[PDB]
């Protein structure tokens, strides 16, 4: 995961889901898999 | 027993009970009548104000004692200020006969 | 002058609080009021009226689930470090009566009468209290009026 506290989608497959406190994204391809804070 | 109202304060006295009440204008012997706020016969209590303006406690002023020597010594701090003055509150003793 | 507090003048009844489903704050406030003796009009902050309070079923006393895993009970030992953090979750699956007793003691005043008073509160996890020698009458909680 790349953790930067200002999270956006990268490609046209990232889903800005929310998951138990941290607001992560998932494009189902762990190229970034980034997550907020 | 009745809650006599005297001196801006109120007291709870039945018949024959001494009370250190304020400096009522009076002497020894000559009685004096004092209003009530609430007079009680155990289960018959009086509450309605016009029913209490009739009920008058009465007792014999006697003794005209003084209170105890209340020593004031005001003193602030480095200010360097003392002010010492005392006080005997004038009182009177009372019996209750109503 | 008062007539309420004197020698041998205060009465000693007993109380059983079933901490069945109640929440911890209401439970502890209720037990604390019974323990100090403010439920009594013959009250004074110098004397110890009040009733021996027993708290039973304190094993299942309600706390927010989101608090059984967050709210912590620290207790320092003087030694550097030695801060013994501990949530009420493990503290509950170890000593729920210690949790309850802690809350109650925290709601009492902070003085020596606080000690003489808290020596009157028993708390047990199961339903089964041993102080049945008396006639411990169940006191359950009731918001009043207004």
């Amino acid at each position: 995961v790349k953790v930067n506290p200002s999270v956006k989608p990268i490609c046209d497959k990232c889903r800005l889901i929310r998951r138990h406190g941290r607001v992560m994204v998932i494009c189902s391809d762990p190229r970034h898999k980034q997550r907020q804070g | 027993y009745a809650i006599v109202k005297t001196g801006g304060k109120q007291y709870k006295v039945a018949v024959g009970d001494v009370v250190k009440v304020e400096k009522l204008e009076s002497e020894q012997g000559e009685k004096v009548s004092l209003p009530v706020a609430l007079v009680v016969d155990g289960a018959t209590v009086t509450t309605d104000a016009k029913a209490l303006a009739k009920v008058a406690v009465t007792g014999e002023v006697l003794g005209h004692t003084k209170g105890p020597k209340i020593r004031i010594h005001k003193f602030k701090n480095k200010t360097g200020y003392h002010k010492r003055q005392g006080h005997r509150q004038q009182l009177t003793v009372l019996k209750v006969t109503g | 002058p008062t007539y309420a507090p004197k020698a041998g003048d205060t009465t000693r009844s007993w109380y059983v609080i079933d901490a069945t489903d109640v929440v911890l704050g209401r439970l502890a406030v209720a037990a604390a009021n019974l323990l100090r003796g403010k439920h009594k009009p013959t009250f004074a902050p110098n004397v110890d009226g009040g009733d021996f309070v027993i708290v039973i079923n304190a094993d299942k006393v309600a706390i927010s689930g989101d608090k059984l895993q967050h709210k912590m009970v620290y207790r320092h030992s003087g030694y550097p470090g030695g801060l013994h953090k501990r949530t009420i979750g493990e503290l509950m699956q170890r000593h729920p009566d210690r949790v309850v007793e802690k809350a109650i003691l925290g709601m009492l005043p902070k003085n020596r009468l606080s000690r003489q008073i808290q020596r009157k509160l028993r708390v047990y996890a199961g339903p089964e209290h041993p102080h049945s020698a008396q006639q411990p009458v169940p006191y359950e909680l009731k918001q009043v009026a207004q």
Partner: protein, 58 residues
Amino acid sequence: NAAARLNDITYNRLIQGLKAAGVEVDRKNLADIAISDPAAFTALVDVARAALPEDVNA
């Protein structure tokens, strides 16, 4: 307050009743008849109840 809550009324409403009824007792003697006479105090509480308006509107 303790004797009031023994009579299921709170101190606030007790005072508001003893005011609206008007029995010019004061907290000192009110507490004395509270201690010695639960009877006279419960008469006072019924006085206060009978002198509360209706509700929390007015």
